[PDB]
Structure formats: structure tokens, C-alpha cells
């Protein structure tokens, strides 16, 4: 119910060796204050 | 009118337990990890010999000549101990342990000294080549606070 | 007309002692048992070696190479420690202990791991065969409430 | 005509303190002695090892391998701790303690068990021969009432 417009998304597998499933995720989301 | 000595002293022992709670809870975890370490060691022998006799790190427990089954090298707080290319990793059980250390593990790995090897102890690592390992970065490593002073080794310790 | 502060505060410390009575009385017993356990251990060494060197459990203290006399392995709360076919049982004295734990005992027994053995700690047990023991059911076992979390093993623990 | 509730209740708290005075004063002393005991212990290690390794009791602190200076093993209520032929005596300071226990002391001594030793705790003692000590009768011993139940040992305890 608030102005968090999510836009450019990314995520990837956080484990170097890849020995267990895990996804680090970085989402960008913005709200629009007045001037 | 009177009775506050019984009320305060029952409430100071109550808060005394709350203060003694985190001390016994890391002393406790730190104790359960000190064993994962003992279970990991004593398997250095097999691994050392295998390396010195062949010049190649044992691929798995059977190669190292130990309980062919990782789960056969478990304990009270240890769910197992696996040898993966000379690296010996110990996993913390899920029952009978702290709370922020279960299912968590550490590793013991060695390095060719040339004629002998030297062992390290620290947070989980993977072997890259016969003389190089790297952080098994994944999120299940036992937290530095629970590791002895003798098991603070980094992937590139020499 | 007046004096109730002295009367109530003498009677709150009186009832405070009555509430602190059972806490100190199991903390206390639980403390006297933790020693029967320490006296039982350290005798694992003798028993382990005897088994690994011969493949048979030591029949008695002398076989295990320890104070040939059970009563010679006593303590403050421990009236003795006897080795009976690899099983080491510790008896609680009759003087200087709780009240519901005196003359009571526990046992430490091991199991062939094949090349090594693993030890258990719990309520009195008898050895049946070289790899099997059973509850020495008789009524003199130290009550579960007085036994550490590390000494809750059952006759068939593996 | 009226005001006796304030007068009696101020005088019941006054007499309540007088009744609570001797209780806090032996609980207190008994607490200051329990430390002289902790300072005395932990020095058993040095003494035990020295004896088992050489078969002779350490003559003094330096021999035992501890603060060569008795005064260097002091505390809040402890003015020091001296090792005299394996016997470790703890002296109560003169400032910060009860009143009938200052400058007073206790001793910890051991006995050859043959392959190991057993420790005792009680009123000051002197060592005669390698397996015999005796009351350091002189008048500065901490009174039995101030000693724990675990430190009531006599010179000839075995």
C-alpha cells in the first residue's frame, strides 16, 4: 500500500564453489517524495 | 507491610539466570565446536599418509582409508566428517547443539611442505589444486566467534 | 500498633530459604552425580586399551589394570567404581550426598566400532555379550533428573 | 494521641537490620573464605605435576612454577597464597574482610595415591614427610564455621 515502485532487478548464485543452492538478490525500488 | 526479601531474591536469581544464559549458551556452543574439531582431526593421519605415499590428496573417505561413509564419522554434535580431496570437513548435527551453529561446519586442510605437510583449521574450504584451496563461501560456516584461537586459519594461510 | 517490618522480613527470608531449598537440593545432587561420572571416566583409558589390545572386555578392575579394589576408586559422594566386563559402574556413597541418590549408581560402557570403540554414559547396565549390554534393572539407578544431558544413554544406544 | 505507626515501623526496620546483621556478616565471611579457597586451588595443577614428574613436593612457589612471590597470588580478601612443600596455604587480607577471619588462613595439601594424588582442603597444615602433614596449630586458622562443607578435612584425612 505504499509507493515502492520496484524496477531494475538482479540476482545470482552467492556460493563460489556452488555446493548448495542460494541466490543473492539485489532489487532496486524507489518512492517519490515532493521537491 | 513486610515480605520483599523473598520476592526480590526470587527475582534476582531469575535475572541471574538470564545473565548466565548467553554465557552458558556460547561457552556451550564453543564446546560443541571444539569436538567437531576433534572428530575432524585424527583423520589427518590417514590423509597425511595418503598424500606422502602417493603425492595426491585422497579424493574421499574411502581413498583416505576411513569409514567409507561420511555419516559413519559422526558424533553428538557432529552429523559427519567428509574427506574431499584431502580437505576434511566436519558438519554440526541439527539436534543437541547451540542454535546458530547446527548444520554448520569447518574444515581442516593441509599443504605440501615438500617431504611433509602442514595442517590448517578454519572455516569450510574447497580444494582447487594440489596446493590451493578456497573459501567454500555458501553460508553454512561456523561463525568465527565459535572457533578456537587455534582454528582461525584463512584459505590462504601458509 | 507498629512493628511489622521486622516480622514480615524475617518471615520472607524464612520462606525464601524454603523456596531456595529444592533448587539447591537438586543443583546439589546433580553436582554430586557429575562427579560419579568423572570418577567413572578416566578409567575408559584402561578399558579401551585392554579391549583394543586383546579384543575382549576387561572382566574386572585388575584386568583393566586399575585399583584391584573397587572401593579404592571412591570419592566424596562416590563409594566406588567397579569394572565388570568393560562396563564401569559408579556407586554413590551413603554419606555426604543428596537423599534420593545415595547408594545409587550409573554406568559407562563401550561398543566395538571395529578398530576403535565408542563410549556411552547412562543408568546402570550389565554386559551380555561383547557387543551388547542391558539395563541392570533393580531399583538403585540414579534418577534421570540427576543425570547430565551427556549421560542420558539407553542400553541400546549405538 | 496518634502517631505510633511511623515510630514503630521505623523501629522494626532498625531491629530488622540488627537481626539481618549477623546473617549477612557470616554469609559474608563465608563468602570471603570461599575465594581464599579458589585462589588456593588452580595451583593444585602446578603442585600435582611437579610431584608426579619428580616424586618430590614443590618446596616453594618458584619450584611449583608459580608467581615466585607469595604476595603475587593475592586477592580482594586474600593477602596471598604460598606453596610450602606441596602444601598450599591461603592468607586472608586484613582489609575488606569479616572481622574474625582476617589474617587467617587455610591449606590444601595432597597425598600420594601412587600414580596420582588426592587433594584435601581444610585448616592450615604443615608437611612433615612426603606423605604426612600436621596441624599448623598456632591460632590463625580460619574458624570451622567459615569453611565450606567441602573443606572440613583433618590433617590425617586419607
Instruction: Give the 3-state secondary structure of C68-120.
Output: CCHHHHCCCCEEEEEEECCEEEEEECCCCCCCCCCCCEEEEEEEECCCCEEEE
Task: Provide CB contacts within 8 A for C74, sequence distance 6+.
Answer: C39, C80, C81, C93
Torsion C113-C119-C121-C125 (CA) sign: positive
Helix (H, G, I), strand (E, B) or coil at B127: strand
Task: Provide CB contacts within 8 A for C123, sequence distance 6+.
Answer: C106, C107, C135, C136, C141, C142, C144, C147
Other CB atoms within a 10 A radius of the CB of residue D56 amount to 12
Contact call for A15 and B138, based on CB within 8 A? yes
DSSP state of B110: E
Q: Does D138 touch chain C (CB under 8 A)?
A: no
Q: Rounded to whole angstroms, how far apart are CA atoms D147 and D158?
A: 19
Buried b (16+ CB within 10 A) or exposed e, C100-114: ebbebbbbbbbbeee
**Distance of CA D144 to CAs D33, D49, D97, D100, Å?**
11, 30, 16, 12
Answer whether C82's CB lies under 8 Å from C118's CB.
no
List beta partners, residue D54.
Answer: none
Cα of C121 to nearest chain B Cα, Å: 12
Q: Rounded to whole angstroms, how far apart are CA atoms B26 and B64?
A: 34
Residue of A12, A13, A14, A16 to mutate when probing chain B, most B C-beta within 10 A: A16
Q: Does D9 touch chain C (CB under 8 A)?
A: yes
Q: Which of B27, B36, B157, B50 is nearest to B107 (CA)?
A: B36
Torsion D56-D57-D60-D65 (CA) sign: positive
Answer whether B105's CB lies under 8 Å from B36's CB.
yes
Cell 576387561, residue? C58
Taking the CA of residue A19 as centre, how many other CA atoms within 13 Å lie in the half-sphere pointing to its CB?
15
Query: How many H helices and E strands in chain C?
Result: 3, 6
Contact call for B126 and A22, based on CB within 8 A? no
Phi first, then psi: give them for residue B108, nearest 5 degrees. Answer: -125, 130
Q: Does B18 touch chain C (CB under 8 A)?
A: no
Query: Grid coordinates representing C59?
Result: 572382566
Answer whether D105's CB lies under 8 Å from D90's CB.
yes
Contact call for C7 and D11, based on CB within 8 A? no
Query: Grid coordinates representing B132?
Result: 590451493
Q: Does D52 touch chain C (CB under 8 A)?
A: no
Alpha-helical segments (H) within C42-157: 44-54, 61-64
Helical (H) or strand (E) element with D48: helix D44-54
* Of the partner residues C8, C20, C150, the one whose CB lies closest to the CB of residue B3: C8
Q: Does B126 touch chain A (CB under 8 A)?
A: yes
Looking at beta carbons, which residues of chain B come within 8 Å of A17? 126, 134, 136-138
Helical (H) or strand (E) element with D122: strand D117-122
Q: Residue D73 class from Cβ within 10 Å (0-12 exposed, 13-18 middle, 19+ buried)?
A: buried
Task: Provide CB contacts within 8 A for D66, sequence distance 6+.
Answer: D43, D46, D73, D83
Query: Grid coordinates representing C22?
Result: 529444592
Q: Rounded to whole angstroms, how far apart are CA atoms B106 and C63?
A: 40
Task: Provide CB contacts within 8 A for D65, sequence distance 6+.
Answer: D46, D50, D58
Q: Does B88 touch chain A (CB under 8 A)?
A: no
Q: Residue D113 class from Cβ within 10 Å (0-12 exposed, 13-18 middle, 19+ buried)?
A: exposed
Q: Rounded to whole angstroms, how far apart are CA atoms C134 and C95?
A: 29
Contact call for C4 and D12, based on CB within 8 A? yes
CA A23 centroid distance within chain = 11
Helix (H, G, I), strand (E, B) or coil at B12: helix
* Method for this entry: cryo-EM
Phi first, then psi: give them for residue D63, nearest 5 degrees. Answer: -60, -45
Helical (H) or strand (E) element with B91: strand B87-92
Q: Rounded to whole angstroms, how far apart are CA atoms C30 and C25?
A: 9
Cα of B50 to nearest chain C Cα, Å: 19
**Distance of CA D121 to CAs B111, C75, D55, D132, D136, Å?**
50, 14, 21, 14, 14
Query: Grid coordinates representing C69?
Result: 579394589
Q: Rounded to whole angstroms, how far apart are CA atoms B102 and B15?
A: 27
Strands of the sheet with D78-84, listed across from one edge: D78-84, D87-92, D105-112, D117-122
Q: Between C and D, how many residue pairs show a Cβ–Cβ distance under 8 A?
A: 35
Cα of D119 to nearest chain C Cα, Å: 11
Greatest Cα pair distance, chain B, in angstroms, is 84
**Distance of CA C141 to CAs A16, C26, C73, C89, Å?**
53, 16, 19, 10
Q: Please give the CATH topology (third level) of the domain spanning D2-158.
A: Glycoprotein, Type 4 Pilin (3.30.700)
**Residue of chain B whose Cα is closest to the Cα of C149:** B96
Other CB atoms within a 10 A radius of the CB of residue A12 amount to 9
Contact call for C12 and B10, based on CB within 8 A? no
Q: Rounded to whole angstroms, how far apart are CA atoms B78 and B34?
A: 10
- Tell me whether strands C105-112 and C117-122 are parallel, antiparallel or unpaired: antiparallel
Q: Rounded to whole angstroms, how far apart are CA atoms A19 and A11?
A: 17
Helix (H, G, I), strand (E, B) or coil at C51: helix
Cell 606422502, residue? B52
Query: How many H helices and E strands in chain D?
Result: 3, 6
Answer whether C142's CB lies under 8 Å from C152's CB.
no
Q: Quick check: do D and C touch, 3+ CB pairs under 8 A?
A: yes
Q: Rounded to whole angstroms, how far apart are CA atoms C119 and B76?
A: 11
Cα of C79 to nearest chain B Cα, Å: 30
Q: Rounded to whole angstroms, how far apart are CA atoms D81 and D83?
A: 7
Answer whether C82's CB lies under 8 Å from C71's CB.
no
Q: Rounded to whole angstroms, how far apart are CA atoms C127 and C135?
A: 9
Q: Rounded to whole angstroms, how far apart are CA atoms D76 and D93?
A: 7
Alpha-helical segments (H) within C41-146: 44-54, 61-64
Q: Which of D94, D89, D97, D96 is nearest to D30 (CA)?
A: D97
Q: Which of C124, C118, C131 is nearest to C88 (CA)?
A: C124
Q: Which of D72, D76, D77 is nearest to D61 (CA)?
A: D72
**Residue of chain B whose Cα is closest to the Cα of A19:** B138
Cell 547408594, residue? C103
Q: Residue B23 class from Cβ within 10 Å (0-12 exposed, 13-18 middle, 19+ buried)?
A: exposed
Answer whether B79's CB lies under 8 Å from B97's CB.
no
Rounded to 5°, the CA angle D83-D87-D91 comes to: 65
Q: Rounded to whole angstroms, how far apart are CA atoms B57 and B157?
A: 18
* Of the partner residues A14, A16, A22, the one whose CB lies closest to the CB of residue B134: A16
List beta partners, residue A21.
Answer: none
Answer whether C108's CB lies under 8 Å from C121's CB.
yes
Residues in chain B: 158
* Of the partner residues D4, D16, D149, the one whose CB lies closest to the CB of residue C5: D16
DSSP state of C78: E
What does the CA dihedral B15, B20, B23, B25 come to, rounded to 10 degrees? Answer: -90
Amino acid at each position: 500500500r505504499r509507493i515502492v515502485n520496484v524496477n531494475n532487478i538482479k540476482f545470482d548464485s552467492a556460493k563460489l564453489k556452488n555446493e548448495k543452492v542460494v541466490l543473492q538478490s539485489e532489487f532496486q525500488a524507489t518512492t517519490f517524495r515532493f521537491v | 507491610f513486610t515480605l520483599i526479601e523473598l520476592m526480590i531474591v526470587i527475582a534476582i536469581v531469575g535475572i541471574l539466570a538470564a545473565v548466565a544464559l548467553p554465557a552458558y549458551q556460547d561457552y556451550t556452543a564453543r564446546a560443541q565446536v571444539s569436538e567437531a574439531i576433534l572428530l575432524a582431526e585424527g583423520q589427518k593421519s590417514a590423509v597425511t599418509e595418503y598424500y606422502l605415499n602417493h603425492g595426491k590428496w585422497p579424493e574421499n573417505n574411502t581413498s583416505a582409508g576411513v569409514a567409507s561413509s561420511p555419516t559413519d564419522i559422526k558424533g553428538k554434535y557432529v552429523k559427519e566428517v567428509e574427506v574431499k580431496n584431502g580437505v576434511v570437513t566436519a558438519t554440526m548435527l541439527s539436534s543437541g547443539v547451540n542454535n546458530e551453529i547446527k548444520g554448520k561446519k569447518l574444515s581442516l586442510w593441509a599443504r605440501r611442505e615438500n617431504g611433509s605437510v602442514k595442517w590448517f583449521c578454519g572455516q569450510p574450504v574447497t580444494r582447487t589444486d594440489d596446493d590451493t584451496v578456497a573459501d567454500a563461501k555458501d553460508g553454512k560456516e561456523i561463525d568465527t566467534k565459535h572457533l578456537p584461537s587455534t582454528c582461525r586459519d584463512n584459505f590462504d594461510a601458509k
